[PDB]
Design an enzyme around this catalytic site. Structure first.
Site, PDB file in Angstrom:
ATOM      1  CE  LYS A   8      44.904 -90.262  -5.084  1.00  0.00           C
ATOM      2  NZ  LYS A   8      45.738 -89.217  -5.761  1.00  0.00           N
ATOM      3  N   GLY A  11      47.455 -90.261 -10.624  1.00  0.00           N
ATOM      4  CA  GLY A  11      47.266 -90.340 -12.037  1.00  0.00           C
ATOM      5  C   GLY A  11      48.410 -90.960 -12.889  1.00  0.00           C
ATOM      6  CE  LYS A 217      52.377 -85.930  -6.644  1.00  0.00           C
ATOM      7  NZ  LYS A 217      53.608 -87.109  -7.245  1.00  0.00           N
TER       8      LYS A 217
HETATM    9  C1  LIG Z   1      38.094 -82.275  -9.071  1.00  0.00           C
HETATM   10  C2  LIG Z   1      39.073 -82.862  -9.727  1.00  0.00           C
HETATM   11  O1  LIG Z   1      40.005 -81.967  -9.823  1.00  0.00           O
HETATM   12  N1  LIG Z   1      39.231 -84.158  -9.749  1.00  0.00           N
HETATM   13  C3  LIG Z   1      40.289 -84.522 -10.448  1.00  0.00           C
HETATM   14  C4  LIG Z   1      40.272 -86.135 -10.316  1.00  0.00           C
HETATM   15  C5  LIG Z   1      41.586 -87.124 -10.587  1.00  0.00           C
HETATM   16  C6  LIG Z   1      42.722 -86.719  -9.597  1.00  0.00           C
HETATM   17  O2  LIG Z   1      42.511 -86.327  -8.389  1.00  0.00           O
HETATM   18  O3  LIG Z   1      43.751 -87.049 -10.176  1.00  0.00           O
HETATM   19  P1  LIG Z   1      44.671 -88.082  -9.060  1.00  0.00           P
HETATM   20  O4  LIG Z   1      44.487 -89.453  -9.529  1.00  0.00           O
HETATM   21  O5  LIG Z   1      46.010 -87.738  -9.279  1.00  0.00           O
HETATM   22  O6  LIG Z   1      44.471 -87.665  -7.515  1.00  0.00           O
HETATM   23  C7  LIG Z   1      40.287 -84.573 -11.969  1.00  0.00           C
HETATM   24  O7  LIG Z   1      39.192 -83.853 -12.509  1.00  0.00           O
HETATM   25  O8  LIG Z   1      41.162 -84.747 -12.819  1.00  0.00           O
END
Ligand SMILES: CC(=O)N[C@@H](CCC(=O)OP(=O)(O)O)C(=O)O
Ligand SMILES: CC(=O)N[C@@H](CCC(=O)OP(=O)(O)O)C(=O)O
EC number: 2.7.2.8
Lengths: 258, 258
Positions: A8, A11, A217
């Protein structure tokens, strides 16, 4: 052979060309010596926020959680399932890796329901069908799966990527690594703790050692491990050269047991 | 032996709920009575332009093709490979169709090079490898393929969807229908010309019989038919009652013969 591994990607990693080059180089190195089926699951975060910024759309919250109204799930789906996903597929192509882009709804890989009427198009992940991804893996493809899903009624849903990755791990009988900015937790003596129980995690927290966003985290990994019933690794791209060993199952970051 | 049918979608259809409902009902109707598998290829129609407006960005179109700057390819990729693609996958889910979303780069299905340095990230499509899509078709999935591709060097490319669908038709050995908001081409006795040669189509353009927006649409089908050496059908999505007959090999719109 081995059971699949879900990597996984968080961001910050997606926002960094350096991290990406190190990741995909690591993936090539690992694949030269190792046979294990690999699956990537990713969110976006930054690319989504950049686009909301540009459209002068407000990003609101209700009780510490995002809200995706009917009228912007389509934009968000674009940023995540489109831009973030295809950016990763472009990196794969540059590095000669046969990747295939998916979202959670392809082959009903992860089933999604609407979390809360008040949050709009936010989904709750649950394990789905492994058939499609198993057949791609059998044929030597690297699936790259975004965290957008769809309900059985045809409504698009934005899903927490950690929870999406957990659902997919359960679906495939896969192991799970949450890759992000934290290379591994260190004890009160600055020594990387290779393996950590829920109990020592809970102690270490307000014993004062695990603080700030690190709490989130670690809590994400604990939630994932609690669900999965096997350990979940926290790691970073920092030591590029250890990633292949990490992918092979060695605890090179911090392994959470809960 | 398979003889898949590619249905190309684009333009205002992608934004019409009633029209999409009727299209997907026709897809189901064809599937219930036929073994021959379907593939969808789609463009970004209103979805891309709508995002550009909201971002207040110049929609520069040189000849047929959107000039696609380096600083806009990500945004366009999101609208096309993300929003448009996942909207169609959501419709597929609503109608209980097992669909899988792809872009041109998945399995190197359609190969793409940069068409012209001046057009920026606009890609020129050529036939690629049928392996991935054939396996999906054999396993009973409906591939839904966006017109974003990627160069060997990992650069994302925006590709004309008619040309992308034609390249995929060559790759798979598929029949091809170009669905758009077209009108019937009438002969001197006011009757729809159901089937015509390329030369006949060219003659009718030269002699002012084919006029206005249909010149563009016939030229696309004509180039496709010449490239493929099989007839290419043009037809309107507005007459959804006729679609199953069209899919069953009836020339309900305008067929350009090889
Ligand atoms: C529902 C919700 O909040 N979805 C996140 C999905 C991205 C995410 O989860 O960012 P990570 O790559 O750090 O996990 C969003 O809308 O940005
Ligand atoms: C390079 C280029 O022109 N790409 C097209 C892709 C979509 C398309 O071809 O329009 P349809 O919706 O009618 O299929 C565009 O950006 O407009």
């Amino acid at each position: 052979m081995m059971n699949p591994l879900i990597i996984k990607l968080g961001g910050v990693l997606l926002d960094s060309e350096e991290a990406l080059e190190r990741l995909f180089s690591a993936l090539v190195n690992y694949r030269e010596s190792h046979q294990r089926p690999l699956v990537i699951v990713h969110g976006g975060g930054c690319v989504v926020d950049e686009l909301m910024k540009g459209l002068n759309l407000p990003v609101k919250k209700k009780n510490g959680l995002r809200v995706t109204p009917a009228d912007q799930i389509d934009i968000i789906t674009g940023a995540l399932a489109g831009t973030a996903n295809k950016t990763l597929l472009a990196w794969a192509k540059k590095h000669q890796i046969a990747a295939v882009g998916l979202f959670l709804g392809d082959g009903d890989s992860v089933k999604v329901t609407q979390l809360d009427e008040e949050l709009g198009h936010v989904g709750l992940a649950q394990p789905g069908s492994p058939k499609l991804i198993n057949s791609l893996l059998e044929n030597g493809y690297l699936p790259v799966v975004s965290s957008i899903g769809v309900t059985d009624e045809g409504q698009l849903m934005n899903v927490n990527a950690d929870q999406a990755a957990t659902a997919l791990a359960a679906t495939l009988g896969a192991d799970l690594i949450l890759l992000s900015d934290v290379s591994g937790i260190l004890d009160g003596k600055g020594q990387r703790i290779a393996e950590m129980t829920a109990a020592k995690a809970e102690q270490l927290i307000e014993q004062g050692i695990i603080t700030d966003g690190m709490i989130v985290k670690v809590n994400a990994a604990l939630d994932a491990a609690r669900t999965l019933g096997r350990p979940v690794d926290i790691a970073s791209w920092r030591h590029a050269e250890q990633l292949p060993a990490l992918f092979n199952g060695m605890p090179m970051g911090t392994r959470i047991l809960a």
